[PDB]
Swiss-Prot record, chain C:
Stored CDD domains: PRTases_typeI (cd06223)
pH dependence: Optimum pH is 6-9.
Chain residues that bind 5-phospho-alpha-D-ribose 1-diphosphate: A131, N132, G133, Q134, A135
Record function comment: Converts the preformed base xanthine, a product of nucleic acid breakdown, to xanthosine 5'-monophosphate (XMP), so that it can be reused for RNA or DNA synthesis.
Species whose genome carries this gene: Bacillus subtilis (strain 168)
Listed pathway(s): Purine metabolism; XMP biosynthesis via salvage pathway; XMP from xanthine: step 1/1
Name recorded for this polypeptide: Xanthine phosphoribosyltransferase
Cell compartments where the protein resides: Cytoplasm
Length: 192, 194, 193, 194
């Protein structure tokens, strides 16, 4: 299954930096493995195939590939939020502020309100879930449109960081394909 | 429909002309993505380069990623997207190129890690728009810096009245543009005569 | 004075010409509002349409609201203001229109709930400024989507050297502008005589 | 009177959407009943007729209509704060942050100090009072200008939410024309009157 394939790729090609950051630039965050992305998208679609999804929401840039493969299988469009000023993202903006615990800056992410309806049932897709600030921002943007959230699909979850618990506590269904329990001693340990 | 037909229909029906030089397609390419259209676009690119020995796709965040990934999926090759800003893990073996912005009137840097580009690679560059061509030239430079060859450049929407295409063709590169726009004057899209 | 002359004097005495083509009137129209002047403006609009069988006024947030509500008060009709952004309760039967900005070369969407526009409505559109006219075209479209008819368009300040007015008039719409500005060059406001 | 007319309108046309949301788009928040707005303004003016009001402060968009009718009766100007960048609100900006529980995100509202002096005795007018964050923002803006606050006039107050108590605790006179004790079980229940 996709989970096993992903876990294998992490153990084979991932590099643990400073027992804290998991570098997977060979297939997710810089180089993209399209076949693996398709398997990931088919797994997300499988979990939400009976939820009435109308639209997927993600955020540039690493989330786009898994989100688009998921939208392809479910047959729904994919909207990616913008982090920086863009040429054609100008008005009708739904925005949220994303605080970085790392560099200690608040930044703004934005989605055009014309692409989210009160009748939309949204699946949020993202590559990493760590502290979860962008995920909260996308939840806010979806709620600002009057739309409902079917759930949140995450490729890699760092389960020792509070992002997941924050979303689940608020009632959101979180579907993480790889759940990392620890990165200490320079190696990846998966949950259970 | 083939990819070109479906893309021209989407442009006609949903594209919005904002000026002589700007065509808004945020409903299916630049903010909302139509994944099925992207697959057809990727399959079309793969067909045109099916016999050319492609080993890797190179694109640039963010709008180029979706058409690039669909092309790599069909061809069965990896996809590398250059980054425009500093990122958490793009930290070593950096290949850099200066990209002049016409609005900002200054150069910004794009980067790819050489870890993912070999001198044995035969690269297909994929991007969403071709206008003044500065990003395309930067991606060409990065591929060359890696010692790799360039099979061609695949473009979803080309503005044929701007110099980007002619500059790449004059350098000898194969440019495959699925929608070629002759003009946006009068607030309407006019495609190159076929 | 009548409303037109009161408005022109206020423009001359408190308006500021920015970049020789933008008229700043934040002291009484676009940020601070002079309610008494607004009432006189509304009464004049009402006078010009007092025998067209107006059933409803349509405007757009935010600067159009005050003159529109004063017009609706005198004519005895409700006022509907279009929205430029998401609103908590704006969800049902939304009629939308695209508004292009020649100044910024961008496009935005405005919306009105169809629940508040009937095929039996005869609508007077009220707005604060008429320049390039794209918002006015958008409100016209929304009224037509509802099957209602347009009695005319009342404008507080018209920049007559810009094409908005001629576009609307060409299409047969009555445009009633209380202050018609012929020029803003030389940092002075010249009115159409 | 205006309170009776308002309660009737709420009873006849208000739609309860939730335990926390009352839809009144038919006369206050989208379609406006100007005559009712007049009644509301005259009532606000009556309650503050002897208090030396020099200016009304409100916030776009729903607050404008009741605020302007109030200023018309009292014979004073009305200033509406803005929530978004606008063409001519460019200098002497007095700003306040406003948090939304509904949104879980913050927002900025602004007034130009050119239209507020330390000579001003301000009546704040708004359409709804719920959690009260926008009201506190307007209070902050008026205090930033060195002006005094005569009180806060509210068309519809949800008394079961903490907005009113916070302002009363800070010493402000809050005059609410309709006070809703509960929206439970899809019905509007008003605060008991003796
Ligand atoms: N590779 C990797 N990335 C991590 C890891 N932990 C967090 N990130 C990424 O760093 C960015 C910030 O995430 P957080 O770490 O939760 O935010 P924080 O700075 O407030 O803690 C995100 O990138 P992004 O916004 O998704 O960037 P982009 O890739 O889309 O440009 C996220 O995906 C990790 O262990 N490995
Ligand atoms: N929608 C639209 N975009 C155009 C058009 N022409 C150029 N662009 C986009 O603008 C960006 C380049 O901006 P400039 O620095 O002014 O370069 P330019 O002179 O070639 O336009 C590119 O975005 P990018 O780097 O691809 O950004 P992103 O979309 O990946 O974030 C390119 O795709 C057009 O007609 N319509
Ligand atoms: N003060 C002033 N404003 C002008 C002038 N010309 C245009 N505007 C205003 O600028 C805003 C945007 O106009 P555009 O849609 O770009 O097209 P326009 O310039 O032809 O109006 C409109 O405000 P709006 O949507 O009504 O904004 P709001 O005030 O309701 O927030 C319009 O009223 C001018 O000379 N002076
Ligand atoms: N219809 C309705 N609206 C409510 C109710 N409670 C609060 N609001 C409105 O929702 C908007 C946002 O409120 P918030 O900033 O989230 O504060 P809140 O937590 O008290 O709602 C405000 O509109 P605003 O800024 O005045 O919006 P606008 O209408 O001026 O655009 C406020 O008037 C309610 O029960 N019914
Ligand atoms: Na991400
Ligand atoms: Na990431
Ligand atoms: Na691009
Ligand atoms: Na682009
Ligand atoms: Na206006
Ligand atoms: Na205006
Ligand atoms: Na309000
Ligand atoms: Na409100």
């Amino acid at each position: 299954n996709a989970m096993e394939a992903l876990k294998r790729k992490i153990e084979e090609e991932g590099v643990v930096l400073s027992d804290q950051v998991l570098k997977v630039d060979s297939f997710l965050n810089h180089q993209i493995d399209p076949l693996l992305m398709q398997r990931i998208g088919d797994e997300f679609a499988s979990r939400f195939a009976k939820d009435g999804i109308t639209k997927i929401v993600t955020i540039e840039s690493s989330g786009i590939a898994p989100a688009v493969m998921t939208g392809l299988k479910l047959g729904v469009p994919v909207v990616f939020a913008r982090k920086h000023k863009s040429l054609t993202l100008t008005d009708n903006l739904l925005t949220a502020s994303v605080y970085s615990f790392t560099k200690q800056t608040e930044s703004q992410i934005a989605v055009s309100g014309t692409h989210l309806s009160d009748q939309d049932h949204v699946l949020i897709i993202d590559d990493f879930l760590a502290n979860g600030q962008a995920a909260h921002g996308l939840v806010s943007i979806v709620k600002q449109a009057g739309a409902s959230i079917a759930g949140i699909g995450i490729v890699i979850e760092k389960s020792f960081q509070p992002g997941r618990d924050e979303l689940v506590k608020l009632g959101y269904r979180v579907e993480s394909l790889a759940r990392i329990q620890s990165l200490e001693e320079g190696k990846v340990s998966f949950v259970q």
